[PDB]
Design a protein around this ligand. Sequence first.
Ligand code: NAD
Ligand code: NAD
Ligand code: NAD
Ligand code: NAD
Ligand code: 9W2
Ligand code: 9W2
Ligand code: 9W2
Lengths: 268, 267, 267, 267
Amino acid sequence: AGLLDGKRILVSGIITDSSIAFHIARVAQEQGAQLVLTGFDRLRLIQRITDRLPAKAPLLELDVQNEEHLASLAGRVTEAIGAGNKLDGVVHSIGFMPQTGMGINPFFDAPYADVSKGIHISAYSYASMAKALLPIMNPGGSIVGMDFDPSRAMPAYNWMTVAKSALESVNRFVAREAGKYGVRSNLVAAGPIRTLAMSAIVGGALGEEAGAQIQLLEEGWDQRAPIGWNMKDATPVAKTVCALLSDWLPATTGDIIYADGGAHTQLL
Amino acid sequence: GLLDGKRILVSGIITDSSIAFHIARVAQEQGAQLVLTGFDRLRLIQRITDRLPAKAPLLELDVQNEEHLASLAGRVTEAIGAGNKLDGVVHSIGFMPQTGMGINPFFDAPYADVSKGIHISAYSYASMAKALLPIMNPGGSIVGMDFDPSRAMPAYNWMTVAKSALESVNRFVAREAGKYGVRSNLVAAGPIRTLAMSAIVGGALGEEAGAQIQLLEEGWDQRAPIGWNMKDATPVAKTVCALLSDWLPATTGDIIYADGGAHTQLL
Amino acid sequence: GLLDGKRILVSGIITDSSIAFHIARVAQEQGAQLVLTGFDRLRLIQRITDRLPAKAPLLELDVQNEEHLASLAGRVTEAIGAGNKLDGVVHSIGFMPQTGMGINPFFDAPYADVSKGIHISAYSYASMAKALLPIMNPGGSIVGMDFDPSRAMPAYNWMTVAKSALESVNRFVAREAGKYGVRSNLVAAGPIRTLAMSAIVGGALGEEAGAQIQLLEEGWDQRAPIGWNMKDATPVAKTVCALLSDWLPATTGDIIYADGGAHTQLL
Amino acid sequence: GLLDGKRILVSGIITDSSIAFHIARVAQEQGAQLVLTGFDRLRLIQRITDRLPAKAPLLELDVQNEEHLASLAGRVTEAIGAGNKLDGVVHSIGFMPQTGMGINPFFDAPYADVSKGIHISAYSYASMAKALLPIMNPGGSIVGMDFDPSRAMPAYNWMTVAKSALESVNRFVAREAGKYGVRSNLVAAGPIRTLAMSAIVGGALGEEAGAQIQLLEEGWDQRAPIGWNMKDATPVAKTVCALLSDWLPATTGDIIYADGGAHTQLL
Ligand SMILES: NC(=O)c1ccc[n+]([C@@H]2O[C@H](COP(=O)([O-])OP(=O)(O)OC[C@H]3O[C@@H](n4cnc5c(N)ncnc54)[C@H](O)[C@@H]3O)[C@@H](O)[C@H]2O)c1
Ligand SMILES: NC(=O)c1ccc[n+]([C@@H]2O[C@H](COP(=O)([O-])OP(=O)(O)OC[C@H]3O[C@@H](n4cnc5c(N)ncnc54)[C@H](O)[C@@H]3O)[C@@H](O)[C@H]2O)c1
Ligand SMILES: NC(=O)c1ccc[n+]([C@@H]2O[C@H](COP(=O)([O-])OP(=O)(O)OC[C@H]3O[C@@H](n4cnc5c(N)ncnc54)[C@H](O)[C@@H]3O)[C@@H](O)[C@H]2O)c1
Ligand SMILES: NC(=O)c1ccc[n+]([C@@H]2O[C@H](COP(=O)([O-])OP(=O)(O)OC[C@H]3O[C@@H](n4cnc5c(N)ncnc54)[C@H](O)[C@@H]3O)[C@@H](O)[C@H]2O)c1
Ligand SMILES: CC(=O)NC1CCN(c2ncccn2)CC1
Ligand SMILES: CC(=O)NC1CCN(c2ncccn2)CC1
Ligand SMILES: CC(=O)NC1CCN(c2ncccn2)CC1
């Protein structure tokens, strides 16, 4: 039947219909998953985006920087999925970095106040969410987060790479904690996708030739990747997140699955 | 079903303990039409495979034999019907002479023996890919079996060196397979109690090496955040099926760790 | 002498147990003219450093303080001489509030505390590099202290996350330093018995974390093919000096493992 | 001098372009007493090694030859004097037949050729270590030459597979050498324009070699934060000397990257 048939999954990180989280939600719904969605700040606006999804799913406010939002989260999810019901999956598709820590802005010129906000949202929050939702999760469950390979330094990504490095390490500790509940915790290291964060927020930080800079990335990535890569299609990444939410990778935890077309395994 | 309407070649079945036996079993449970290859003890392999959920054709394949590999693509077509192609290939073949493993010192392994080991455990992954890529479908997958060789461990000795060579081979195969729209990956499994494994644990290859593997196993389940049961090959078989499916479409030249998460934990 | 006629800034001396104390000692033994930075307890730091082979100027430096970093380059030149530049910088600074390490649960660390930890242990490496690269000579070297964070270990918790962030910071610093002809590297040391470490082993931060560190040490010496004596910081200090010298000229944005070889061995 | 009063065996000199020639030169400049091993073209090697800063004995050594390896330890003692031991061994031996490396397709390499390559490039590191560890001093060092095989690159094909196998062999040698107080490491050099390399690359690119080598040279220099000059083997030779010295005493079974830091940068 459906890959995620009869599974209750919380999905965070939907802002646009371009968002990786939107496509994860779409593919999971196509596979018979009952979703619960998280939104940040503009909640009346996110509802209009999620209305374009295959099916109706409850939407909850969640600012990961907000301690009251996280404390109330587990209870708010239960009132949304029914008492005596638990989650089978959690998707962390949250990332942020102030522009001072991106693009052409010099690496040394990023104030720690900005880098800290970035690390809080992009890495610390993965642990914040896991703490908040593990009590309402089922043994056999899965936590999946989004990653960009930070093992080698790349220009323009700067302090966002540092937060991804921190995230990769956070995921390994979460794995230990989640393990006590019979829950797996993994990251999907995706290749580039023309989402809003990329196209607009990262693109903004690149200056005059930003457009060709982003196009050169797709071209070089499609080149390295033995099976090619399309920055305009989030479906391969969404499918990979669903594979992790399913019961088909049962002995995989505290790990990184590379959904990048195989570009990381190739030098040229 | 997960592998519904998929033609998959599975190699490496010798016992009902074999990782390939469990891959075959789970694949069949998921609606896959299999083709099986066997080495040397074919009478026994028929007998073993007869206990699978469904009947699947069995073909002779010694990876060291050039005539066997040259005829392989044609023999598979004659078994799956003309104008039909494979959607998956499972390489679950491994070998290392007794001199290259266990209590026998690392330096006392003759190159003739280490070479046989490398031929079968690593070079053969490329031999099979060359042989079967022409009869594969775009969207298909090649999956091989691996043990994490990034750190040196006692007793595994020269098999670690063959698995290191294999990890590298897999990355070149991905380039070649990529031209056909085929993915190539390895599943890095945790220690599994096959017949050889439990014989070695019973100090067959030697007592010092016997307790070594036993410490490895106990250590693996401690380190693994979700635990590791070396008496259950089903998590590994399920992971190979995930790779054969259409659910990891952007993953190639890679290693998926189906080891209970132990490679990520120091203690 | 290995570092003959070299001006090196050394940070991170607080006791005679400090890895920075031994780096300073070995560097001085090799003909290096040092400049030392101290944090908060300067009266004590003056007093410790007085027991070094030679007299070296001591400067106040809180990496969390923006005024301290802005004035740093000037203060160093007032200490080494006008028209003189540094040939080396040693970052031996680390910190993590008690809620981020030890027996305290991983999930119970407030971000305010984790942030302080990351600021001092990782961000500061970039803060120091920004501050001192203008007063550095082409051929120069920046060396930082690291603990291998690639695998998660109990008790280290959020200090591991800061080390992971540091490894990444070092790779970007490498790019920046490269413009000045300066190398940037980290020395991944094995566990060393500092006063802090010796305290934890005595169940200061809780018996469960005390036993954990003891198993870590015991395991490290087993794994290390040449052994690991956590009561001897001299091998680590010698490794930092090799990086400060002109003998690893093509090595930048990297990690040198001074851990007895433990990271390469599974058992 | 860095290697003052040290007896070092150096293998792999064939041309004045050879990485082993530059290691020998720098080691001699630092006060090392050398012993040289040569293969096949000994008449030519003698003439080349006369152009070195000092006279060093030359011994025949085909790593494929079992009689050569069995007699090696005795031949070295007869050359360095009885009761004297080696403090260092340099393995700068590599080989891959045309079919396994170049413009020839990955799948078109016969195993007979790939096996010769693996024997010489990887297995030999263990062969030499077995042969010379009995005549080595505690504190001693074995150093081998490696090209980063972690990611697959075009043309390098099976030489990458042998480098992968080598990285793993070095980790096992590290365990064996550890029993004698000997360290075992690899230097992961960036591309060096040696005569062997020029022909390998030159032969692969055909007529279109000019422009492509220029982009390749420019590519390395960009990626390397401190730059990379293929015409200069001195940074690599200096790095091998740092490993032969007493300045990296707690580093074994490891890889030191002398590539200008190119491996740490994505672009
Ligand atoms: N686009 C790529 O190339 C790419 C590649 C790899 C990984 N990623 C990762 O995928 C994830 C999603 O990014 P995307 O590219 O889909 O773009 P996006 O714009 O859709 O995602 C950013 C999301 O983070 C949320 N967010 C930010 N701060 C928050 C806070 N304080 N509390 C709650 N939510 C907050 C935003 O509301 C938004 O939905 C991120 O983790 C990103 O780093 C993106
Ligand atoms: N058992 C474990 O703990 C474990 C863990 C990780 C990986 N593996 C790997 O999984 C694979 C399967 O091993 P296993 O543990 O199931 O043991 P196994 O003995 O059941 O499987 C090895 C197979 O290789 C076959 N083979 C040997 N020489 C051959 C040749 N010349 N031509 C063709 N086939 C040949 C054997 O007949 C056998 O079927 C191997 O690659 C092994 O290295 C095993
Ligand atoms: N001890 C080990 O086992 C070990 C192993 C590997 C790496 N390390 C690393 O080596 C470094 C030194 O640690 P150590 O073991 O010598 O202990 P330590 O306590 O002697 O060193 C840490 C130093 O950080 C300094 N510091 C703290 N806050 C500061 C601030 N705001 N500004 C400037 N300096 C500040 C302290 O004065 C102290 O000198 C740390 O980065 C640590 O992570 C330690
Ligand atoms: N040149 C580069 O760009 C580069 C980069 C990284 C690593 N390396 C490595 O450096 C080493 C030296 O390579 P090079 O570029 O100086 O080329 P080279 O041809 O000058 O050196 C290789 C040596 O191997 C010897 N050799 C071959 N077969 C032998 C055998 N059977 N027995 C004994 N010796 C044998 C040759 O006589 C020769 O001296 C090799 O291990 C190579 O893989 C080279
Ligand atoms: C753990 C692992 O990889 N095991 C392999 C080892 C090589 N091999 C084997 N070798 C000799 C006799 C029978 N089998 C197959 C199983
Ligand atoms: C091995 C390691 O990382 N050690 C560090 C830990 C953090 N730190 C510290 N934090 C608080 C009090 C004193 N020291 C410095 C030493
Ligand atoms: C970069 C690298 O690994 N270079 C090696 C390759 C193998 N080799 C060689 N192979 C065939 C003929 C002569 N030399 C020596 C140089």
